[PDB]
Design an enzyme around this catalytic site. Structure first.
Site, PDB file in Angstrom:
ATOM      1  CG  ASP C 171      -2.266   0.519   1.024  1.00 30.44           C
ATOM      2  OD1 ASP C 171      -2.777   0.148  -0.012  1.00 30.44           O
ATOM      3  OD2 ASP C 171      -2.859   1.186   1.924  1.00 30.44           O
ATOM      4  CG  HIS C 254      -4.722   4.071  -4.562  1.00 35.61           C
ATOM      5  ND1 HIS C 254      -3.346   4.103  -4.381  1.00 35.61           N
ATOM      6  CD2 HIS C 254      -5.247   3.546  -3.446  1.00 35.61           C
ATOM      7  CE1 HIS C 254      -3.059   3.699  -3.159  1.00 35.61           C
ATOM      8  NE2 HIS C 254      -4.202   3.347  -2.583  1.00 35.61           N
ATOM      9  CG  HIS C 257      -6.897  -1.109  -5.025  1.00 40.77           C
ATOM     10  ND1 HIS C 257      -8.059  -0.423  -4.778  1.00 40.77           N
ATOM     11  CD2 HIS C 257      -6.867  -2.125  -4.162  1.00 40.77           C
ATOM     12  CE1 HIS C 257      -8.692  -1.010  -3.777  1.00 40.77           C
ATOM     13  NE2 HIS C 257      -7.977  -2.042  -3.377  1.00 40.77           N
ATOM     14  CG  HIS C 271      -6.447  -1.627   0.098  1.00 41.44           C
ATOM     15  ND1 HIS C 271      -7.584  -1.126  -0.505  1.00 41.44           N
ATOM     16  CD2 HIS C 271      -5.546  -0.625   0.089  1.00 41.44           C
ATOM     17  CE1 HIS C 271      -7.378   0.147  -0.834  1.00 41.44           C
ATOM     18  NE2 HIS C 271      -6.148   0.456  -0.505  1.00 41.44           N
TER      19      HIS C 271
END
Ligand code: NAD
Ligand code: NAD
Ligand code: NAD
Ligand code: NAD
Ligand code: ZN
Ligand code: ZN
Ligand code: ZN
Ligand code: ZN
Lengths: 367, 367, 367, 367
Positions: C171, C254, C257, C271
């Protein structure tokens, strides 16, 4: 003497630019003959027609016979006169593009050039190489100007076989080495003068782009997709290399390429694949440092170019064939004589065998 | 968006190249209108006539009125149709070249330009500025292509006032900073697309050439002789900056130039002299590192360019005048909007005052 | 426009800080509801109760149902009103923490946040991500301030499964790349303004900390012990990454993701594990240099993050799934549009396949 | 010990941001006491009232007495309860902001601060200094949190006297050296723990920002305009130094400042002006390398800060006065004790005399 740089008047590259062809071409002429590679017309002919039609242009499409020969050009002149076109578009690989330039010159009209592969540095130059229908070198046709417009669809290039991108890398990787040799020796360029700074800078940018981006670009070509590395390598293979060779200079790598075509074994390898070995040969002649040799050998190997004579199917009677290559390379008016201090047939022979040995050790060590 | 680079088709530079105009221009046309003013034809006419005659070409000399205006173009076109000219040669400074480009456009014929000075980067570009017969801006005339041929006699340029070479340095020094800003902002260039790598490399080469060669070249310019430094600076001032601005991008420095022309005080200064202050203004706007601004101020100062408002004769009511400059530089359509994040009038105002203070401190230290 | 940076009012990390919770929290309120991850309450509930009791506070403990949903939040509002608490403490992983923030906002009271893992950059932000009870994205809840207090027990983090520390590395490794892209493009941040220098510096520190400390930190997490490298990586995964993403910016990593969550195959990966592949995808888009790609791929590989689509269980119908990922990534209002020059679905698709290829070659070469 | 960083919840900086106070403050409360002195409300009041009104907020303007004292706080609180204010906005210099923070604390409500100068690093911190109505130090008021919101209008700051910006540079330049010393000694920070990495990185960024941007920003400050250099220095002077001192640590430079205030001669100098000499004193104490002391003396001198005792008007009885300074700087509780190895009065005395001699030599050379 005078310092000269030549360029196509405009160079355009972008994904799906084939859809904007008509709009880019419109300032040059209303009526067009397209000379098209047959493979390409097979997937793109409607797209081409739509692009012209949407821009309000008139177009007729002539499939290309496959060789840039006097007969093919003459055939196409006949079609062009009937069509009464104001301009020629070439769309295909190097053979299609050289044919379109020659045709346009004989008709006295503007030419646009749309490479569908980035396989050689032909597109941008003020030169067409003419062959016999049997595929043998006939003559150089010197054009009084470079193409008016060069338009590169990066998505079409990405959809082509990845081997043809590698081939273009092999063609373009020579550019800096040859232009630098000519700078060092003070040789005249094909543009008819000494080197400009502009041309050497573009030649050096070409080399550094391939070093930094070549392997990344091959991943994209293998997946048939467009990335920034691929866009950069296409520009290098096309604009940088084109200006770099014509206005910066040719030397041993191209002379050795020409030598190698006198050998039947390698005749069906691509232009750039032979140039690639010619570059290694050149680095022996100019005594490049070990790390430069290794950097070039490693990049060539990584994109699948030959770094040995066996990778060009030269496996038997090697001494005798390399004599032939060396003599052809040093023939009167070859570019090998642009190397600092020149090169005799013996020096080129020596460089061929030693470059082959360097290639062979590089490969062994790579396991 | 597509990536586009445009270029003149052929750029030639060399000492006494005026003797070779014929051989170089022959491939484009047999019959030429030669447009030059009294002063230039004064020293050049007999040389031109002999070069053309010996190449087997026909020439019609048309003395030029001095202003690039619709009337002047119409007149000359008058003369060109009568004479049945296939091509225009402009010989002289920027107003003559501008005129030859526009004329050639309207008549649908090729253009060659032979600058006798190297004071702006406009010559190689695909743009003509049209003026009133009285000398006021009328409109920009966008051209579908760059001049077919650009031919620079370095010996004629060396005979021009040294001030004009410095002014050229002032114009060309902006190139890298404006192209870099447009590359950072993703702005569209005058060539109609995003930046190529080629254009950015030539813009950066322009900058580095001026840093390395500027002072050396000014010694040659002041002695009115040709050295390799002068040759390189002429290339930078003409080919590299021309391609760099048009295919790399314009930004704050040119917008500030435009603002400064709304101030009567600065009327007696050349284009490149005002641009030199615009570059320092831009470096404040983009908050360039101290070492970069110092390098640019030092080069500008060393070749005699202005680094303060007082050196453009702006000495009274300076706040009030800088509001006028800032407002004009930020007018809709101006290139200041290509800066990353844009620029408001207030930001440009601030940069003008601070760039001036910076220049003043720099001059104080230098003694 | 305005430059804005946001932070939790206070961030505290230390070994066994769970014993000092009560003393740190006392300035905020006397009565507390704790929303606690069930696993954590299983080993720590008495310790929590003792910490509050020793500080003279009143506390009630509500076990967390496991999803940050509107229903769970509503359930907890009911408990909170009855308890008449003056503040909420979240203690758990990201889902617990986002629930506590949302609850505290709906009750209009202060929130403290006690991560028991360093798995995501959720803790510090002024945002709660709401899901359906089925575990699907519902909505973003934008909070008017960041948590009042964030308290990280490094020993509790060290006792958690090491895979969850790796996930947080994945992350946080995106942070610098995304904030730099936003700096380059001039994009607005989640804080509502342009980047401060402070935020970019913390984002860059985050990246360099992971490079220098990530592998060392994993040794400690695997042995369940606290070392200085682990303390530094926890700070990076929590404070640096939190401020860095919210006040520096989000971009392609992101967006990718989010795309990947539209694929069932990867839905139960963490995540950060999906963010990790998103970072490699981003480095293709922004054409990162070979050595940067390799450094990131090597760190990701060394801590056990995925660098290929197969490591996220995307093994069949890859082209079709990557179309889905690419379209979702470029949906209106995604952060991919913060990349310099933007990104089309085709560009993202291309980047996905090429990043996968880079990953696959990295792994092959690693034997 | 735990590692702690504290921060204001939200820091906002931009030109004319005073127009946006309403939209930014709305999320915290509907009803506001606005505390400012006559001078500030002089230029700011109508702008504030319109910004609040348009956001739908209620304001009660309370002119400020000029001194941050218990009486003044009580009075204003008087007014705030009557008006039923949910939040305090302080607008002005440090005494106004100090007061708003203390008031808001005593009333248990949120505080926003809008500095109109950038002359100290105190605004963002969780500390209020209380004074006698006569202007004498009474006590420090430690606050449980930093201001909820800090809003800096760079255009208002640019209009302030340039001397106050330099003073701010003097205050902020100490930050890195004092935090670094506390990191080397392991001292506890005002935030209550050991140094985070985040705080040290922001302290070092403060230092590097001032080195890179200090002189550029002073040109903007003297012309009363906003440039990016000024924006960066304002951030350094306000956010970076505020977090750096409070969460990074104070040491000799602040202790020396305190010592200097026991000397009537230096009474007419600003906080940051005395701190600037304290920093040079500290560099002697810690035996910083010659190049570091020279860099700091040069920056201090270039922006007009004192680097000698004579530039603080300390010209007579200097030994006797420096004994007083040294004794006060070393008083129990002072931050000089955070230096690695501590410092005795005799060591500090020695450093004061030598720092003065160093400054004197530096000024002599500079001419
Ligand atoms: N004029 C110059 O300066 C110059 C410089 C270098 C080379 N050349 C000439 O270039 C020629 C070589 O060009 P080449 O190697 O491109 O040959 P080519 O034109 O025959 O193209 C190679 C092959 O690629 C295929 N192809 C093209 N586009 C494709 C696409 N989009 N998808 C799939 N297949 C596609 C063609 O069908 C062809 O079979 C030689 O004749 C050489 O002399 C000229
Ligand atoms: N606002 C503007 O109009 C503006 C601003 C900046 C620059 N400029 C440029 O500067 C020019 C202004 O000058 P000009 O129009 O009078 O041009 P010009 O041609 O008269 O410039 C000086 C001339 O002196 C010649 N010369 C002198 N001695 C010589 C010698 N011994 N050998 C050879 N050549 C010799 C140079 O070749 C050159 O042609 C414009 O045409 C434009 O290009 C214009
Ligand atoms: N708000 C934001 O800015 C932001 C940013 C990133 C992610 N998020 C959110 O964060 C969530 C993901 O958080 P997560 O991955 O931590 O999930 P999570 O909260 O479910 O925790 C993951 C697992 O870790 C276990 N766990 C926690 N502490 C433990 C401990 N000490 N020992 C052993 N096991 C322990 C939990 O029981 C749980 O099973 C998502 O909902 C995502 O949207 C929010
Ligand atoms: N020992 C101390 O008390 C000490 C020491 C050092 C620094 N300081 C700081 O310095 C301050 C001293 O000055 P002050 O209290 O008189 O503060 P002040 O607010 O009066 O400072 C000058 C003011 O001029 C304003 N200004 C002037 N022209 C302007 C324009 N055109 N546009 C906008 N604003 C304009 C500035 O915004 C600023 O508010 C203290 O409040 C404190 O913050 C105090
Ligand atoms: Zn070739
Ligand atoms: Zn210009
Ligand atoms: Zn995340
Ligand atoms: Zn201070």
């Amino acid at each position: 003497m005078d310092r000269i740089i030549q360029s196509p008047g405009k160079y355009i590259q972008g994904a799906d630019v084939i859809n904007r062809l008509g709009e880019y071409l419109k300032p040059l002429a209303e009526r067009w003959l397209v000379v098209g590679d047959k493979f390409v017309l097979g997937f793109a002919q409607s797209t081409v027609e739509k692009s012209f039609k949407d821009a309000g242009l008139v177009v007729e499409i002539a499939p290309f016979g496959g060789e840039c020969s006097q007969n093919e050009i003459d055939r196409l002149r006949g079609i062009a006169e009937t069509a009464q076109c104001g301009a020629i578009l070439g769309i295909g690989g190097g053979k299609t593009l050289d044919t379109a330039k020659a045709l346009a010159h004989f008709m006295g009209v503007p030419v646009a050039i749309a490479p569908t592969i980035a396989s050689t540095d032909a597109p941008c130059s003020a030169l067409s190489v003419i062959y016999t229908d049997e595929g043998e070198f006939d003559r150089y046709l010197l054009l009084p100007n470079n193409p008016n417009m060069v338009i590169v669809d990066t998505k079409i290039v990405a959809g082509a076989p990845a081997r043809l991108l590698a081939a273009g890398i092999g063609d373009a990787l020579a550019t800096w080495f040859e232009a630098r040799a000519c700078s060092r020796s003070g040789a005249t360029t094909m543009a008819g003068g000494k080197c400009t700074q502009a041309a050497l800078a573009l030649a050096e940018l070409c080399y550094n782009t391939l070093l930094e981006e070549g392997e990344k670009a091959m991943l994209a070509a293998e997946q048939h997709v467009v990335t920034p590395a691929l866009e950069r390598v296409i520009e290098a293979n096309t604009y940088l290399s084109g200006v770099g060779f014509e206005s910066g200079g040719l030397a041993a790598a191209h002379a050795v390429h020409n030598g190698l075509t006198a050998i039947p074994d390698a005749h069906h390898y691509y232009h750039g694949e032979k140039v690639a070995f010619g570059t290694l040969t050149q680095l022996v002649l100019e005594n490049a440092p070990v790390e430069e040799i290794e950097t070039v050998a490693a990049l060539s190997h990584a994109v699948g170019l030959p770094i040995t004579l066996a990778q060009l199917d030269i496996k038997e009677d090697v001494p005798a064939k390399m004599r032939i290559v060396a003599e052809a390379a040093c023939a009167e008016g070859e570019t090998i004589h642009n190397m600092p201090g020149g090169a005799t047939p013996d020096q080129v022979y020596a460089a061929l065998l030693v470059a082959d040995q360097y290639g062979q050790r590089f490969l062994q060590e790579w396991e």
